[PDB]
């Protein structure tokens, strides 16, 4: 495609395709500095994997969930988002409610394996 971050100024619909390109390259004064950045790299990465895990998205690149889109977050249509705004434009507009939706995905996953546990009781 375009490379690493190649579709940063592209529409959210075009950048959403081939997301495995920004998924690969995500993971003594010189020595201590270099080892300092090596440990931090694994920490920031595992935090994202920790989040994807407690959402049911562990292993997913595109992951649909149960939480409905509250129009208080953004009253924009799908067409005026994915075919117009860029991924950097979008999450500045959602920046406030981003911490609210992280909590919603976690309860929708703990109230999904708990309903799944009763399902396999029969």
């Amino acid at each position, epitope marked *: 495609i375009l490379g690493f971050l190649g579709a940063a100024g592209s*529409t959210m*619909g*075009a950048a959403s395709m081939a997301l495995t390109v920004q998924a690969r390259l995500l993971l003594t004064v010189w020595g201590i500095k270099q080892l300092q950045a090596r440990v931090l790299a694994v920490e920031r990465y595992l935090r994202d994997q920790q989040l994807l895990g407690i959402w049911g998205c562990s292993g997913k690149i595109i992951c649909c969930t149960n939480v409905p889109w509250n129009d208080s977050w953004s009253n924009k249509t799908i*067409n*005026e988002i994915w*075919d*117009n705004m860029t991924w950097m*434009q979008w999450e500045k507009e959602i920046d406030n409610y981003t911490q609210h939706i992280y909590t919603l995905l976690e309860v929708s996953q703990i109230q999904q394996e708990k309903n799944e546990q009763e399902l396999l009781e029969l």
Partner: nanobody, 128 residues
Framework: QGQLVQSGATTTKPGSSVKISCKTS????????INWIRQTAGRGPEWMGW????????????????RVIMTTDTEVPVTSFTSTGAAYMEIRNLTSDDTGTYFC????????????????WGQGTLLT
């Protein structure tokens, strides 16, 4: 979400050629096409043609293909998503039939099937 101011009301006589400007602001000028529409006294509205400030690509109706001179500048960036550009409009064989109000119109989206649709209009310029 920006302004598309145009030139004044310049009135010449048939046979000549008139230049019309279209200065943009408040939006990424390269991300959206610039359409040109007119409403003459004799017909209704008539689509002339749009131009791509990014691809440099032009598409214009066959009724205005061998008359229209259509160009753009290159945007002067203000911020990360703001810029300032300009689109220009000229005509060849001018008559009093082409007398009417002319505006420029920025495109609707950046992808899909209604990309160029004239959404954000200018102000209007009265010809001869």
């Amino acid at each position: 979400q920006g302004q598309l101011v145009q030139s004044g009301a310049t009135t010449t006589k048939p046979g000549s050629s008139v230049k019309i400007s279209c200065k943009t602001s408040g939006y990424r000028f390269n991300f959206y096409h610039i359409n040109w529409i007119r409403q003459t006294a004799g017909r209704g509205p008539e689509w002339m043609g749009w131009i791509s400030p990014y691809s440099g690509d032009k598409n214009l109706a066959p009724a205005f293909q061998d008359r229209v001179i259509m160009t753009t500048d290159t945007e002067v960036p203000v911020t990360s998503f703001t810029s300032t550009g300009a689109a220009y409009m000229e005509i060849r064989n001018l008559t009093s039939d082409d007398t009417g109000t002319y505006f420029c119109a920025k495109g609707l989206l950046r992808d899909g099937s209604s990309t160029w649709l004239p959404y954000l209009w200018g102000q209007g310029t009265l010809l001869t």
